[PDB]
Design an enzyme around this catalytic site. Sequence first.
Site, mmCIF file in Angstrom:
data_model
loop_
_atom_site.group_PDB
_atom_site.id
_atom_site.type_symbol
_atom_site.label_atom_id
_atom_site.label_comp_id
_atom_site.label_asym_id
_atom_site.label_seq_id
_atom_site.Cartn_x
_atom_site.Cartn_y
_atom_site.Cartn_z
ATOM 1 N N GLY A 1 54.247 44.794 38.834
ATOM 2 C CA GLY A 1 54.334 43.687 39.775
ATOM 3 C C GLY A 1 54.677 44.069 41.201
ATOM 4 N N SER A 2 55.211 43.101 41.955
ATOM 5 C CA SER A 2 55.596 43.283 43.354
ATOM 6 C C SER A 2 56.843 44.162 43.538
ATOM 7 C CB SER A 2 55.880 41.907 44.025
ATOM 8 O OG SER A 2 57.083 41.243 43.600
ATOM 9 N N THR A 3 56.936 44.860 44.664
ATOM 10 C CA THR A 3 58.167 45.535 45.055
ATOM 11 C C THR A 3 59.344 44.630 44.897
ATOM 12 O OG1 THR A 3 56.849 46.129 47.000
ATOM 13 C CG2 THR A 3 59.067 47.105 46.786
ATOM 14 N N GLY A 41 60.438 43.821 41.466
ATOM 15 C CA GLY A 41 60.887 45.140 40.898
ATOM 16 C C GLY A 41 62.352 45.391 41.264
ATOM 17 N N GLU A 96 56.202 49.860 38.001
ATOM 18 C CA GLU A 96 55.022 50.180 38.748
ATOM 19 C C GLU A 96 54.840 49.048 39.697
ATOM 20 O OE1 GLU A 96 51.574 49.305 39.932
ATOM 21 O OE2 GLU A 96 50.589 50.033 38.133
ATOM 22 N N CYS A 152 46.792 47.809 42.122
ATOM 23 C CA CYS A 152 47.946 48.538 42.691
ATOM 24 C C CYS A 152 47.531 49.801 43.497
ATOM 25 C CB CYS A 152 48.935 48.906 41.545
ATOM 26 S SG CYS A 152 48.305 50.211 40.383
ATOM 27 N N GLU A 162 50.847 45.457 51.329
ATOM 28 C CA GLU A 162 49.862 45.323 50.281
ATOM 29 C C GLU A 162 49.337 43.878 50.317
ATOM 30 O OE1 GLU A 162 50.921 45.130 45.898
ATOM 31 O OE2 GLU A 162 49.478 46.772 45.800
#
Lengths: 488, 489, 491, 491
Positions: D241-243, D246, D263, D297, D394
């Site tokens: 997923g997203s930063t 995360g 990831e 990604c 991103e």
Amino acid sequence: ELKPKVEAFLNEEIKMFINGEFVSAIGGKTFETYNPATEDVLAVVCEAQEEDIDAAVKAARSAFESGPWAEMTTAERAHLIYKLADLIEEHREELAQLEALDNGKPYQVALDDDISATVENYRYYAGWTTKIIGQTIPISKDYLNYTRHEPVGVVGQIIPWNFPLVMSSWKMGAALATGCTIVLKPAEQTPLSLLYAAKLFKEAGFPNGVVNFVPGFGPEAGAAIVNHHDIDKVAFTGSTVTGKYIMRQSAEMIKHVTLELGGKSPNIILEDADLEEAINGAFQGIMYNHGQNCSAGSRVFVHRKHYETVVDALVKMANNVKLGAGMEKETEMGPLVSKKQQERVLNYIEQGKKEGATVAAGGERALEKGYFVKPTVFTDVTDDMTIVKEEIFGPVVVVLPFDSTEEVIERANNSSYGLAAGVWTQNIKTGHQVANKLKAGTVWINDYNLENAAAPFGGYKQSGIGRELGSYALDNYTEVKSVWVNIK
Amino acid sequence: IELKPKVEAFLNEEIKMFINGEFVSAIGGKTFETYNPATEDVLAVVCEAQEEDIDAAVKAARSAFESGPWAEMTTAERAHLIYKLADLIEEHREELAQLEALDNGKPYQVALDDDISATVENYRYYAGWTTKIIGQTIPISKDYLNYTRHEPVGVVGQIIPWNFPLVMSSWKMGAALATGCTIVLKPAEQTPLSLLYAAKLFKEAGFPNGVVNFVPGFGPEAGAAIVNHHDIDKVAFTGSTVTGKYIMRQSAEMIKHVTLELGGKSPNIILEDADLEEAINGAFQGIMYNHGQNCSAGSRVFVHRKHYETVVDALVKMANNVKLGAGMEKETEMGPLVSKKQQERVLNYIEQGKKEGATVAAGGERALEKGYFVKPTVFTDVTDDMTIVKEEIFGPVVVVLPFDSTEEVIERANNSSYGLAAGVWTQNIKTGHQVANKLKAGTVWINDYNLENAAAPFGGYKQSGIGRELGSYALDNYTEVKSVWVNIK
Amino acid sequence: TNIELKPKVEAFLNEEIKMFINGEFVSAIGGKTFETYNPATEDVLAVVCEAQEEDIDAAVKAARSAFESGPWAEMTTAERAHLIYKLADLIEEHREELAQLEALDNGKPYQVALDDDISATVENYRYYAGWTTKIIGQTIPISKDYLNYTRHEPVGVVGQIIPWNFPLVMSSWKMGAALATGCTIVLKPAEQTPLSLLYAAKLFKEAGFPNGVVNFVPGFGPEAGAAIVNHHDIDKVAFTGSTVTGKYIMRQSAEMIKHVTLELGGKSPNIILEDADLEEAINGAFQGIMYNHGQNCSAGSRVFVHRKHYETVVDALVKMANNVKLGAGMEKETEMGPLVSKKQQERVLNYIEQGKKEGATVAAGGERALEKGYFVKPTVFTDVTDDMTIVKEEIFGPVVVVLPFDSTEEVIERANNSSYGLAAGVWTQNIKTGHQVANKLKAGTVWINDYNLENAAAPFGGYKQSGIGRELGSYALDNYTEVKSVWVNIK
Amino acid sequence: TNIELKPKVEAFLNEEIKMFINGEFVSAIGGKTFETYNPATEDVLAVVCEAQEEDIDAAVKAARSAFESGPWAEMTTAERAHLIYKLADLIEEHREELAQLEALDNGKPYQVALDDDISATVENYRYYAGWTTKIIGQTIPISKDYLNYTRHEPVGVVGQIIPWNFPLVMSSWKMGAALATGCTIVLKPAEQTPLSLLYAAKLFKEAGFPNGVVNFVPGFGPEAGAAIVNHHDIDKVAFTGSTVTGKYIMRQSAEMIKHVTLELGGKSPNIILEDADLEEAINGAFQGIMYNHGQNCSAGSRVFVHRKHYETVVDALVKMANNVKLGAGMEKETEMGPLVSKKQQERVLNYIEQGKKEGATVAAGGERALEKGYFVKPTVFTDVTDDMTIVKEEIFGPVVVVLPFDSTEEVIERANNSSYGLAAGVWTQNIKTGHQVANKLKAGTVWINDYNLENAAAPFGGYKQSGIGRELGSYALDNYTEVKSVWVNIK
Ligand SMILES: NC(=O)C1=CN([C@@H]2O[C@H](COP(=O)(O)OP(=O)(O)OC[C@H]3O[C@@H](n4cnc5c(N)ncnc54)[C@H](OP(=O)(O)O)[C@@H]3O)[C@@H](O)[C@H]2O)C=CC1
Ligand code: NA
Ligand code: NA
Ligand code: NA
Ligand code: NA
Ligand code: NA
Ligand code: NA
Ligand code: NA
């Protein structure tokens, strides 16, 4: 000019090393090792006979089964090897002299290459002692399954004359790291550096018997190692015909063998190579150590578009080579190791002349005396000739033009040998593709003759069985035991 | 036990060879006979590979290795072929267990539960390896990328004996095939059936032509042609120590890598603190399993003096109580030995025993009217230098030795040219591992005996072998390590 | 009877203790200093430069530069290995000095510092020096169209925080692995035990480490520590300490998506089964908890004893506890030194009080000892229940609880019923029981018929809340690397 | 031209989509349901039972029981291997149905879902099935006095959260590894893409997985998601997923000292050097970003081009961009589908707007497309600088930025100047340059003369803020294991 410890060493009978002691042969015989740049006797050495090999093997068996070598922790074993390496480094200049004098190579390369590598190899292998791991295998809840990588036991090792000390280190580094004990024979013509280094095994603190050095001749000391009933495993480096012999003899006792034989390795220069680099690589590839190198690039295949640029350049390089005694500061190439070898390669050069190949340089002998031979470049050759197919082991190179990549691969692989290969090209796909297709243990892309303790080397086909160096060498000195513990 | 229809069909005709993906007769038409050891009747007639046929197999394997689907194929694809083979053998499980009972002699139910199930599990295991045979990246210097490739060696020749026919073919081929090699394989003249039947399954699983080639026949002709073949890159063999010597000797002329699994005279040791009940069962099964036609048979039972009398009594009773019979008879516990030649060979060992003065506490003679049977035999009053105590008999014959101390039994256990396996029975945590560590043998079972699995390596020390089979280890036998150096200065 | 100060130790202690940054011994940018004490006497042992945020920032810049260019970045792996090897030789050369510093600064007995700590330090660098040339990636056979390989690259600049219980050896666990991979380091010793490390720094310099490959920043948890934890340019963090502080570190690291390795506390069980070799198990049980004054992560703080042997074990541990000779580390007759500090002594004394309050029995010790110094008597608690604070919580003192059990299934359930899972010991002569019970215990390390054994080659760490990841062994190297997978099209 | 629905897909969609817990298909405990849409039509595709915290608890209890006792806990490695293999055979047998659900539910083109995602799923399970019998620990020679060995044990009950961009194949990355080690699973598909996984569930039941070994809980991030992240009885967590999310997952995990694998995004550079093979490199650049509609990604969202070739590559990518056939996934001519949701379309359009606002040039696309569904035109931004938001962040759409550069040293510096570090591609025909540049780029994966290559056997993951840990390969197994070091005294 001699180092005081070298002068001292050579001022007396050279003893063999058995059960931690310097001793004479039981029968008292001795032989002479010569200085190939002058033909004079360099030293007189105790001549190991079958009875001595048998005392050595008894010493090695005892050190393996009981005593400190058997009891020592892996760290303790490791420290002994590390201390050995330190000692060798300390005696670097004395060992380089001994090699330059006994073997014939130039002092400065024995020091910078040979001795330096011996040090690095022992350091590398010391590191392995505490890392020779086995496996735990999940199979079933009812059992704990694991493997132990045990030392094979007493091992017999035969070392040739072209890289005496370094090769002793390849063989011993790995075997001693596993916990084995050794019975090792140096070549009759190059026993000095190893026998001098035995002082350093004793000083580093090796228990008696862990290593045993028996200088001598192949048919007596040699064969006594190969045929010995209490030697667990054998390793040898030499000619393909002697290799066949060791294997044949080893069969009698279902004894593991590791062999590195010779080759007729190809060094390939493709159309898109960096021609400057490839020419220097091609020249060093054969001429390094006077051609006395298993992996010498004795077949320089050059792309038709650059055949003439290359063949010219190698001729000018081959002429420029300053031949001399190794112990002279300006010597680039020394003499061969013995009169037998000198004849043997002179007989190849002519055998080749009588076969139709022409000489763009060399093809004779060199200087007033010494077992020398001029660096030689052969031109106008054909794949079926004697000098193209067989290992000469002197500074003789055959140069062959080619017109397609698929052709050079086929012709490079058409050989009973496959020790090594070089590939010169700037293209990323070509360099990997070609290296993938070549049937050799080691391939260098845009280089040649590189070795390091961490990277295995050895042959495909009749160039050998097994590998030396790297983690890989360790498997040659181990017996895998699978233990199953019922825990139902 | 009634024959399956696909077995009947199979035996209703000349048993063909498998070369280059086709069922074919010998080029010169020769054929031989395989027998049913429980009856002595001919079981089938088989095509007989000669040197020229081995030459054809080898050229087919060379071609399948150098070019074509097996050479292009991804590791995943190769793996799936091997997995599909296993499924197919599983499907034909009953037919294969029948062939093995008829051709080899062992009892149908153990061939099914043991041999055929292990074959399936071995191919499944090795299929899993295809995508995991990794080389190394080696950090040495900033100026070079250093890496190794574990390449398949090429064409490999393999010879398997007759005691565990189908399973042993799987040990050999599983690992070789996982690395990408191609095979020329020879089954024993005595037991070519289960392999030749299984050939159908290789075809149906989709193996490309020539990846595998099966050449049944005789050692001196078919065997020798494999061993001596100039274009076979590496050889593997299981059998007698004596023929092993031969193979290695011959392999020398071409500097050819060898893997050998030879015999043994494995010790099975009952310590004082052993669970005597389980130990007795392990001792008995360790020798009597597969009629003693087992490399790793616990043919020397060492027993702590305190328990000697007790376990000798029990092994004698158990010996005298095993039901001998035809493998395809459901009450059979032990079938006959494999061939007249083996029955006489073993009988000869027993005579030598009696004559050397050992006692026969049980068995010691042939059994039933026809068939190559030998009664379970227990030798007693024996000594370390006796022929029977030292040599591999390969029949259901055990030799029982008493001992007084642990250092003693270790020494006597190790006093042998063989070193394939060992058993140790003790309930003490320290003794069990200490003793296991001191035995010179490829496999030690602590409080068990005769266990094999695809994941755990097997082989001998000393004159019981060179190299290992099974586990990750076997794979190293089928590979040539290549070190590549890329100058990036 | 005193062990005589070593001249180099005396010389070291005679001046301000500098920190080590970019190859030089320096004072703090702001000039602050702090005091470290001798826990046996309560006297000041040395005044040491106190690293602030600005100093951590300087160390991180130095490390960054040494990783990105310079000799460390260019050296072959053999050359890096030789550096590590020579540093281990220097440590060994200064073995007495460094053992005296551990004894003086940490409190532990000199002979134990020497034989254990210093010797383990040496071996740990020797081990890891061996790994430099052997950190290998893979070549992966996937398809004929590609060459697939991985590289195990050093992660970069690593922040390391070491506690006070095994100062030097803990620094080696951390640094050996990391240095073996080619990383560069910013490391903080505990405020209470900065000496051995700062002395060791002379040795890193002498071995020839390039400038900034290692950087030592002594100071306080809330300033120097948090500055490492919170630094934008530290690539990875490693920590050992309290489970509570561990939580903090992981929570902070979340903000930069930073890999964390942590070794936290435990309440390790040491289990004596009916068939144990009782004499060996009693000694193991006693050393298991008393070793290093109980200031040990993996201490067998819960001694489970099969009902048959319970009273026999209690009586033996009582007699043993009462026979321990307490005293200063630098005195030859000492068997157990003081706790590291007043705060720690107060902490364990409080735990003992809680134990008594909660209804446990003090079978031995249970109070402070001697006139001066942070001493606590070895203590044995009986009559405890599983729900007691002293049985659930890490005490970190020479304090043990003894618990009887009636079945193996029961002991396994009670041993595993904890947030912790650092280690366990199991005592039994039976081959099947040993392995079965080791398999079922949720602990990173299990000793069968032993306790408190560590070696460079064998991994160590916790399950559950005792930690994340492992130190020592090959395993510790993977915490210091990034895996790069390279595909080369060769179609 | 529509692709005709498979009978089985039609029968599945005909009813309420149940969740899977303890081997049975069931409703949420509280009866709630949610709608998943078809992103090409905007119609409701199915109504699915919505897992709540109470449902996750049920799933965790089931996984816990399956891990601690019963067949999964007793099975041999070969047997557990066989279950994995059979599951893969089943997935293959339902390949069309699963590819149709992917196309319908996620929006990607059917043929791509088929040839790529669903075939990678199959291969991924076959690969991990093979690892079951080969997850080995070590025997460590240390001393003659001990047998030292390690066991790589399953960590236990693992909570897994997977995004919506590669639904099925992502579930396989995660479950393949974790199932091979012997773990049990509680997995959540993205709100927007639950179908392929819930359909697959039938196959797990059919392959013979024991009750509870896999549990699927579809629902929302802040309810079903957060409950996995925050459950006290989940031993490890894995998230893609997203930063930003995360960070949250790691912050929450800190509280239990729980191992995390993550990831996250990237802003991967795809670099074309002067000696690149331009025709190959242009195709790779285009596909590098447009694959999966940019919902990738690893997407080469920054195309760096050597000055010499800049204009040629820009014109080529503009022409290819404007030639893509946008349409429904279930329409045979479709080359690029819609984005997954109104929300994702709104976000990417937002990004494009910001790009225009910050001064960049839209050389192509830059707006929505079609009359219904979440489509966005393939977009090419030029006249860009390193500090713009669209160059740094991103976007996750079919949007690319093109940037020239003048030296190799410059492009390494610009490519690495990013908080992300997922992947990179390098285009050059020179053997030296390829490897050199690959070695210097800080990315988990580097493709030399290719882009977007994935395989079960090769690890994947991020450096820096792109993640922690690796998935795929042997490496992914370590995330699901707890290392136990056993010491057996044999003195
Ligand atoms: N450890 C084990 O698993 C085995 C051990 N042995 C030992 O050998 C003893 C006698 O049996 P025997 O079969 O004669 O043993 P051999 O070693 O002679 O034969 C073993 C296998 O090799 C084949 N073979 C024989 N000669 C050659 C040759 N020159 N070149 C290539 N292959 C050859 C045989 O084929 P064919 O059957 O076609 O003749 C047989 O399958 C047994 O009693 C036992 O002690 C035997 C088999 C297996
Ligand atoms: Na000489
Ligand atoms: Na060979
Ligand atoms: Na037969
Ligand atoms: Na202090
Ligand atoms: Na944890
Ligand atoms: Na949807
Ligand atoms: Na990261």
